[PDB]
PDB file of C-alpha atoms and ligand atoms in Angstrom:
ATOM      1  CA  UNK A   7      -7.171  87.550  54.444  1.00 27.42           C
ATOM      2  CA  UNK A   8      -6.904  87.055  58.197  1.00 27.59           C
ATOM      3  CA  UNK A   9      -8.609  85.095  61.082  1.00 31.37           C
ATOM      4  CA  UNK A  10      -9.290  85.353  64.859  1.00 37.04           C
ATOM      5  CA  UNK A  11      -7.922  82.457  67.041  1.00 34.24           C
ATOM      6  CA  UNK A  12      -9.674  82.080  70.468  1.00 32.51           C
ATOM      7  CA  UNK A  13      -9.741  78.746  72.384  1.00 34.45           C
ATOM      8  CA  UNK A  14     -10.358  75.932  69.875  1.00 35.37           C
ATOM      9  CA  UNK A  15     -12.016  78.330  67.356  1.00 34.12           C
ATOM     10  CA  UNK A  16     -10.871  80.010  64.139  1.00 32.71           C
ATOM     11  CA  UNK A  17     -13.115  82.894  62.973  1.00 37.28           C
ATOM     12  CA  UNK A  18     -12.758  83.696  59.248  1.00 39.66           C
ATOM     13  CA  UNK A  19     -14.750  85.608  56.619  1.00 36.06           C
ATOM     14  CA  UNK A  20     -17.373  82.997  55.366  1.00 34.61           C
ATOM     15  CA  UNK A  21     -16.449  83.877  51.734  1.00 33.96           C
ATOM     16  CA  UNK A  22     -12.751  83.114  52.392  1.00 31.02           C
ATOM     17  CA  UNK A  23     -13.347  79.896  54.416  1.00 30.59           C
ATOM     18  CA  UNK A  24     -11.247  76.887  53.140  1.00 29.69           C
ATOM     19  CA  UNK A  25     -12.304  73.288  52.618  1.00 32.12           C
ATOM     20  CA  UNK A  26     -10.783  72.504  56.096  1.00 36.31           C
ATOM     21  CA  UNK A  27     -12.891  75.332  57.610  1.00 36.77           C
ATOM     22  CA  UNK A  28     -16.024  73.754  56.172  1.00 37.17           C
ATOM     23  CA  UNK A  29     -14.794  70.180  57.099  1.00 40.82           C
ATOM     24  CA  UNK A  30     -14.401  71.386  60.764  1.00 41.16           C
ATOM     25  CA  UNK A  31     -17.512  73.703  60.680  1.00 41.09           C
ATOM     26  CA  UNK A  32     -18.743  74.854  64.110  1.00 40.79           C
ATOM     27  CA  UNK A  33     -21.133  77.697  63.013  1.00 40.31           C
ATOM     28  CA  UNK A  34     -21.714  79.910  59.932  1.00 37.94           C
ATOM     29  CA  UNK A  35     -24.018  82.778  59.094  1.00 40.81           C
ATOM     30  CA  UNK A  36     -24.215  83.804  55.361  1.00 41.63           C
ATOM     31  CA  UNK A  37     -26.046  87.029  56.291  1.00 38.96           C
ATOM     32  CA  UNK A  38     -23.034  88.019  58.669  1.00 41.49           C
ATOM     33  CA  UNK A  39     -20.179  86.775  56.341  1.00 46.85           C
ATOM     34  CA  UNK A  40     -18.829  84.777  59.366  1.00 52.03           C
ATOM     35  CA  UNK A  41     -17.698  81.120  59.639  1.00 50.64           C
ATOM     36  CA  UNK A  42     -16.171  79.492  62.741  1.00 48.66           C
ATOM     37  CA  UNK A  43     -14.203  76.232  62.450  1.00 50.46           C
ATOM     38  CA  UNK A  44     -12.580  74.001  65.139  1.00 50.87           C
ATOM     39  CA  UNK A  45      -8.762  74.005  65.714  1.00 52.50           C
ATOM     40  CA  UNK A  46      -6.425  71.432  67.280  1.00 54.07           C
ATOM     41  CA  UNK A  47      -4.090  74.207  68.704  1.00 57.53           C
ATOM     42  CA  UNK A  48      -5.309  76.527  71.448  1.00 59.91           C
ATOM     43  CA  UNK A  49      -5.917  80.106  70.296  1.00 58.90           C
ATOM     44  CA  UNK A  50      -4.865  83.110  72.518  1.00 58.91           C
ATOM     45  CA  UNK A  51      -6.813  86.090  71.054  1.00 60.54           C
ATOM     46  CA  UNK A  52      -9.223  88.017  73.460  1.00 63.05           C
ATOM     47  CA  UNK A  53     -12.768  88.894  72.181  1.00 64.44           C
ATOM     48  CA  UNK A  54     -13.943  92.384  73.257  1.00 65.03           C
ATOM     49  CA  UNK A  55     -17.118  92.299  75.416  1.00 66.60           C
ATOM     50  CA  UNK A  56     -18.220  95.981  75.215  1.00 64.44           C
ATOM     51  CA  UNK A  57     -20.121  98.532  73.001  1.00 69.50           C
ATOM     52  CA  UNK A  58     -17.014 100.589  72.068  1.00 68.68           C
ATOM     53  CA  UNK A  59     -17.484 102.647  68.789  1.00 68.19           C
ATOM     54  CA  UNK A  60     -13.749 103.364  68.410  1.00 71.51           C
ATOM     55  CA  UNK A  61     -10.850 101.092  67.643  1.00 72.81           C
ATOM     56  CA  UNK A  62      -8.052 100.331  65.248  1.00 74.45           C
ATOM     57  CA  UNK A  63      -8.078  98.073  62.158  1.00 73.06           C
ATOM     58  CA  UNK A  64      -5.310  96.454  60.090  1.00 77.02           C
ATOM     59  CA  UNK A  65      -5.475  97.524  56.387  1.00 76.23           C
ATOM     60  CA  UNK A  66      -3.368  95.059  54.251  1.00 75.33           C
ATOM     61  CA  UNK A  67      -3.690  97.150  51.078  1.00 74.16           C
ATOM     62  CA  UNK A  68      -1.863 100.035  52.989  1.00 75.38           C
ATOM     63  CA  UNK A  69       0.232  97.914  55.331  1.00 76.20           C
ATOM     64  CA  UNK A  70      -1.158 100.264  58.059  1.00 78.51           C
ATOM     65  CA  UNK A  71      -3.394 100.303  61.144  1.00 83.09           C
ATOM     66  CA  UNK A  72      -5.971 103.060  61.163  1.00 82.83           C
ATOM     67  CA  UNK A  73      -7.961 104.423  64.137  1.00 85.61           C
ATOM     68  CA  UNK A  74     -11.686 104.687  63.333  1.00 87.97           C
ATOM     69  CA  UNK A  75     -15.108 105.517  64.671  1.00 85.37           C
ATOM     70  CA  UNK A  76     -17.675 102.903  63.698  1.00 83.60           C
ATOM     71  CA  UNK A  77     -21.498 102.478  63.836  1.00 80.40           C
ATOM     72  CA  UNK A  78     -22.965  99.819  66.172  1.00 83.51           C
ATOM     73  CA  UNK A  79     -23.633  96.400  64.523  1.00 85.01           C
ATOM     74  CA  UNK A  80     -26.730  96.748  62.324  1.00 84.27           C
ATOM     75  CA  UNK A  81     -28.498  95.461  59.138  1.00 78.64           C
ATOM     76  CA  UNK A  82     -26.936  97.322  56.219  1.00 75.96           C
ATOM     77  CA  UNK A  83     -27.739  96.864  52.470  1.00 72.47           C
ATOM     78  CA  UNK A  84     -24.438  95.616  50.828  1.00 72.26           C
ATOM     79  CA  UNK A  85     -23.950  95.856  47.008  1.00 71.81           C
ATOM     80  CA  UNK A  86     -23.297  92.631  45.045  1.00 72.52           C
ATOM     81  CA  UNK A  87     -19.667  91.369  44.996  1.00 76.07           C
ATOM     82  CA  UNK A  88     -18.066  88.276  43.345  1.00 80.09           C
ATOM     83  CA  UNK A  89     -18.999  86.315  46.627  1.00 82.48           C
ATOM     84  CA  UNK A  90     -22.608  87.451  47.401  1.00 83.18           C
ATOM     85  CA  UNK A  91     -25.612  88.985  45.468  1.00 85.84           C
ATOM     86  CA  UNK A  92     -26.769  92.346  46.881  1.00 84.22           C
ATOM     87  CA  UNK A  93     -28.542  91.857  50.203  1.00 87.68           C
ATOM     88  CA  UNK A  94     -28.694  92.962  53.915  1.00 89.66           C
ATOM     89  CA  UNK A  95     -25.567  91.930  55.887  1.00 89.14           C
ATOM     90  CA  UNK A  96     -26.383  91.687  59.536  1.00 89.34           C
ATOM     91  CA  UNK A  97     -24.220  92.629  62.618  1.00 89.25           C
ATOM     92  CA  UNK A  98     -22.141  94.969  60.267  1.00 87.85           C
ATOM     93  CA  UNK A  99     -20.285  98.071  61.614  1.00 86.88           C
ATOM     94  CA  UNK A 100     -19.289 100.937  59.256  1.00 83.50           C
ATOM     95  CA  UNK A 101     -16.339 103.363  59.451  1.00 83.59           C
ATOM     96  CA  UNK A 102     -14.942 105.980  57.116  1.00 84.21           C
ATOM     97  CA  UNK A 103     -11.650 104.367  55.853  1.00 84.31           C
ATOM     98  CA  UNK A 104      -9.839 102.620  53.068  1.00 84.67           C
ATOM     99  CA  UNK A 105     -10.805  98.980  52.239  1.00 87.16           C
ATOM    100  CA  UNK A 106     -10.267  96.651  49.232  1.00 84.93           C
ATOM    101  CA  UNK A 107     -11.639  93.122  48.796  1.00 87.53           C
ATOM    102  CA  UNK A 108      -8.252  91.554  49.920  1.00 90.65           C
ATOM    103  CA  UNK A 109      -8.427  93.617  53.191  1.00 90.69           C
ATOM    104  CA  UNK A 110     -11.109  91.085  54.410  1.00 91.50           C
ATOM    105  CA  UNK A 111      -9.959  89.335  57.629  1.00 95.27           C
ATOM    106  CA  UNK A 112      -8.053  92.380  58.890  1.00 94.43           C
ATOM    107  CA  UNK A 113      -8.918  92.715  62.710  1.00 93.98           C
ATOM    108  CA  UNK A 114     -10.670  95.699  64.301  1.00 95.78           C
ATOM    109  CA  UNK A 115      -9.516  96.026  67.934  1.00 93.63           C
ATOM    110  CA  UNK A 116     -10.476  98.281  70.944  1.00 96.14           C
ATOM    111  CA  UNK A 117      -8.908  98.441  74.505  1.00 95.45           C
ATOM    112  CA  UNK A 118     -11.090  95.304  75.388  1.00 94.97           C
ATOM    113  CA  UNK A 119      -9.820  93.103  72.497  1.00 95.26           C
ATOM    114  CA  UNK A 120     -11.062  91.847  69.101  1.00 92.77           C
ATOM    115  CA  UNK A 121     -14.293  93.693  67.921  1.00 92.63           C
ATOM    116  CA  UNK A 122     -14.567  92.172  64.441  1.00 89.80           C
ATOM    117  CA  UNK A 123     -13.112  91.559  60.926  1.00 91.73           C
ATOM    118  CA  UNK A 124     -12.999  93.487  57.741  1.00 95.20           C
ATOM    119  CA  UNK A 125     -15.911  92.108  55.588  1.00 94.24           C
ATOM    120  CA  UNK A 126     -17.284  94.904  53.164  1.00 95.94           C
ATOM    121  CA  UNK A 127     -16.295  98.192  51.547  1.00 97.03           C
ATOM    122  CA  UNK A 128     -17.045 100.797  48.869  1.00 97.38           C
ATOM    123  CA  UNK A 129     -17.208 104.595  48.454  1.00 97.80           C
ATOM    124  CA  UNK A 130     -14.632 105.256  51.159  1.00 97.27           C
ATOM    125  CA  UNK A 131     -16.318 103.139  53.897  1.00 99.07           C
ATOM    126  CA  UNK A 132     -15.012  99.920  55.612  1.00 94.17           C
ATOM    127  CA  UNK A 133     -17.525  97.389  56.955  1.00 94.26           C
ATOM    128  CA  UNK A 134     -16.561  95.107  59.780  1.00 94.57           C
ATOM    129  CA  UNK A 135     -18.415  91.818  60.862  1.00 92.77           C
ATOM    130  CA  UNK A 136     -18.948  92.181  64.626  1.00 88.00           C
ATOM    131  CA  UNK A 137     -17.998  89.071  66.797  1.00 85.25           C
ATOM    132  CA  UNK A 138     -18.607  90.703  70.243  1.00 81.52           C
ATOM    133  CA  UNK A 139     -22.029  89.124  70.561  1.00 84.80           C
ATOM    134  CA  UNK A 140     -20.674  85.541  70.037  1.00 87.32           C
ATOM    135  CA  UNK A 141     -20.225  84.839  73.790  1.00 85.04           C
ATOM    136  CA  UNK A 142     -19.743  81.035  73.155  1.00 84.90           C
ATOM    137  CA  UNK A 143     -16.312  81.796  71.516  1.00 81.53           C
ATOM    138  CA  UNK A 144     -14.908  82.111  75.086  1.00 76.97           C
ATOM    139  CA  UNK A 145     -15.878  78.596  76.433  1.00 75.16           C
TER     140      UNK A 145
HETATM  141  C1  LIG B 201     -15.292  93.156  50.632  1.00 73.86           C
HETATM  142  O1  LIG B 201     -14.583  93.715  49.531  1.00 73.86           O
HETATM  143  C2  LIG B 201     -15.388  94.282  48.569  1.00 73.86           C
HETATM  144  O2  LIG B 201     -16.243  93.761  47.968  1.00 73.86           O
HETATM  145  C3  LIG B 201     -14.981  95.709  48.370  1.00 73.86           C
HETATM  146  C4  LIG B 201     -15.323  96.328  47.198  1.00 73.86           C
HETATM  147  C5  LIG B 201     -14.889  97.646  47.003  1.00 73.86           C
HETATM  148  N1  LIG B 201     -14.249  98.376  47.884  1.00 73.86           N
HETATM  149  C6  LIG B 201     -14.013  97.776  49.023  1.00 73.86           C
HETATM  150  C7  LIG B 201     -14.251  96.454  49.367  1.00 73.86           C
HETATM  151  N2  LIG B 201     -13.902  95.866  50.569  1.00 73.86           N
HETATM  152  C1  LIG B 202      -1.917  93.365  64.483  1.00 75.62           C
HETATM  153  O1  LIG B 202      -1.489  93.696  65.863  1.00 75.62           O
HETATM  154  C2  LIG B 202      -2.444  94.277  66.656  1.00 75.62           C
HETATM  155  O2  LIG B 202      -2.942  95.276  66.433  1.00 75.62           O
HETATM  156  C3  LIG B 202      -2.718  93.419  67.844  1.00 75.62           C
HETATM  157  C4  LIG B 202      -2.548  92.020  67.802  1.00 75.62           C
HETATM  158  C5  LIG B 202      -2.844  91.262  68.967  1.00 75.62           C
HETATM  159  N1  LIG B 202      -3.254  91.816  70.074  1.00 75.62           N
HETATM  160  C6  LIG B 202      -3.442  93.166  70.112  1.00 75.62           C
HETATM  161  C7  LIG B 202      -3.200  94.009  69.039  1.00 75.62           C
HETATM  162  N2  LIG B 202      -3.430  95.341  69.173  1.00 75.62           N
HETATM  163 ZN1   ZN B 203     -14.219  97.796  73.718  1.00 75.63          ZN
END
């Protein structure tokens, strides 16, 4: 689990969104595994605006942060899980690293701020849903 809090937005994995997230829906993209809901409290996270390919992600199944190199956001074929059939996830970034389903929502960060959130994994790879392109998160 985990979310990003910026302005009056909460960014979560679409597959982990709650009933309140869907009741306060701002934007969702199934192909990206992202959902943004509205919040009453002001968020204070900074979204990275950059094309860094290095950063640090929180891994709840290790209680550790790991520095990684990751690919630029792209359309990557993702195997079926309990949440989606097999399909292309868009705006996905891969790194070599440990990931388990419950690690979804872990934040990937660079020097500029939040890059994205843990969304996918398998065979020693961790996939992160990019948020850096969502410029509207910042007004
Ligand atoms: C998104 O979680 C998964 O489906 C997953 C499966 C297997 N290994 C890592 C994972 N993250
Ligand atoms: C989980 O802690 C972090 O890595 C972090 C949180 C908030 N701002 C910057 C950070 N590096
Ligand atoms: Zn950056």
